A and B are shown apart, each in its own frame.
With several copies, the nearest count.
Chain A
Amino acid sequence: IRCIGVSNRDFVEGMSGGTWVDVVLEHGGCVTVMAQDKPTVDIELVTTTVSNMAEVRSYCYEASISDMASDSRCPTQGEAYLDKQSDTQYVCKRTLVDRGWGNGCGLFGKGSLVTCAKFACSKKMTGKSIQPENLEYRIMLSVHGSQHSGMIVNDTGHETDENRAKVEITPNSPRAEATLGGFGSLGLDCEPRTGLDFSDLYYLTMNNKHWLVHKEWFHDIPLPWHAGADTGTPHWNNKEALVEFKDAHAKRQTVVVLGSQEGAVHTALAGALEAEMDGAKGRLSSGHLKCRLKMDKLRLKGVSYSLCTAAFTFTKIPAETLHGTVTVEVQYAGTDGPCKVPAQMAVDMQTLTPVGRLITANPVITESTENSKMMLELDPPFGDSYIVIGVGEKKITHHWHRSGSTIGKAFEATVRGAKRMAVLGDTAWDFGSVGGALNSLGKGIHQIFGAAFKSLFGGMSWFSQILIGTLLMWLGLNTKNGSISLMCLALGGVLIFLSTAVSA
């Protein structure tokens, strides 16, 4: 529910003591958490919006030249005036021109002209800046419980909180007063100030499309500056990346507009994050967020809810997620009231032996009439298994053949750990529920390694770090005993390892 078939979903251990777990949820890929007969609940970040942003430096990627100007002071008659060069809308490069009896001069030599042409602008690009103020997350909570198939894409049904609850999270209030009608609240507290490295990123805007930009890249662009804002036509700074005028054969000046730099800067961003912006309200995807969940206000809605012998007919044919779970949708044929429906995995007969693990805890029917559709997420054991639904005699079953070993799940978990510690860095080490000095050590070593690693190898992307990884691995194949022996397997491997899982 909001997290079945959405893949790159992870699930974490449990409640582990304190009833207070940590998780770094993100924009794509969501987290189910499950803990010790409390309702399993999954959380997704979808749209982090930023309002109220200010405008640091702009850039003009087109030019509009006119009017030009000219000088022509004969040689050894001094330097030329051109009043327009006193005004700041005009651009000038004084050059030297060979002259003679042709060009209207008595003496021979260089004449020192400059055509000073009027710079103007059309279609600039803006570089709007954001601080952690006026920021927002809109996280969503979707407790498994009992919902239909049509109520897991259904965004509108959060107006009454059955299990769906949208929760607006701003960094001035980093706690989620998050009630879930039917049972108790959840109440997760966040750290939005340690977001996705904010106050280091700008919204770059060209024309109706916007993307995030690292600020050192942004200040290193050579185009005009437009430092504050857009009232009238501004004072354009630096004026030399654009309009280019030169001299050949001592005939006039080729004054070139130098055109339009959209594709130039679009090629120049290859590490940007596309956002979208509407009334300003710059909505943003690709964020991650370290909200730590607090349990113990959660409570299973009606653990009692008597067993309800009935007839179970499937609505839909059940399936099997790529994170090895099974999704079953039953009708219950409408006997009586809100009451529990048990399910089992059976390696034995049709009845009488449970294996595996139910994901959705306390699965239930909410309403009395004919077809209440409860969907169940289940976790079969690695071999063969049948599905048992409530009644000890009158029921319908399955077979699944899980098709993956426990060693395959361990390898998939290590590949997911590779992608975690590649994407989120040291912050990915905060999935494991609070570990005292264990995860504090495992976070401290990575935050004192990754800072120095960002200082050394921060400026290298896929193909330029493949080369250094290959070279340092070749060095570690042929060096001495000591430190440099354990250099390649720790560092060239970690370069190619941070490369090949970014995506892909």
Chain B
Amino acid sequence: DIQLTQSPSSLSASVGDRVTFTCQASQDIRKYLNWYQQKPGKAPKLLIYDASNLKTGVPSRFSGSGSGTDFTFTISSLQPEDVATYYCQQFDDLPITFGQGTRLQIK
């Protein structure tokens, strides 16, 4: 149901790098995608609603874009408190699907 492929599986970068994440749905999701980072077993940190918008309280180093079905998340400067598992979430039609995940590691 509305498969949502998340590329890549896991990454690693040093402090202060720019990194991009891709999520591709098999169907047209308009602008209905969301972005999580989840620290393991913890209350998470907030990234993106509506595939392009930051929330109040979020630091501005995170950004999101994407128009048709391909969506790009972007961290401008990697920080040591940004190691988490990164997820993207469809909103359309129901059986609301998450991505598989994207893990990071501090170099």
Contact = CB atoms under 8 A, between A and B. Distances in A.
Contacts of B92: 52
Contacts of A53: 93
Interface in A10-65: 52-53
Interface in B83-107: 92-93
A105 to B, nearest CB: 14
A55 to B, nearest CB: 9
Interface residues of A, number: 2
Nearest to B92: A52
B91 to A, nearest CB: 12
B59 to A, nearest CB: 21
Contacts of B93: 52-53
Interface residues of B, number: 2
Contacts, number: 3
Interface string B32-46: 000000000000000
Nearest to A54: B93
Interface string A273-310: 00000000000000000000000000000000000000
Interface in A51-92: 52-53
Nearest to A55: B94
Contacts of A52: 92-93
A76 to B, nearest CB: 14
Nearest to B93: A52
Interface string B8-37: 000000000000000000000000000000
Nearest to B27: A52
Interface in B58-96: 92-93
A314 to B, nearest CB: 12
B53 to A, nearest CB: 10
Nearest to A52: B93
A56 to B, nearest CB: 15
Interface in A359-409: none
Interface string A158-196: 000000000000000000000000000000000000000
A371 to B, nearest CB: 11
Nearest to B95: A230
Nearest to A53: B93
Interface string A398-424: 000000000000000000000000000
B4 to A, nearest CB: 16
B79 to A, nearest CB: 28
B29 to A, nearest CB: 10
B77 to A, nearest CB: 25
B76 to A, nearest CB: 21
Nearest to B30: A52
B28 to A, nearest CB: 9
B85 to A, nearest CB: 29
A-B pairs, top 3 by smallest CB distance, nearest first, are A52-B93, A52-B92, A53-B93
3 contacts: A52-B92, A52-B93, A53-B93
Interface of A: 52-53
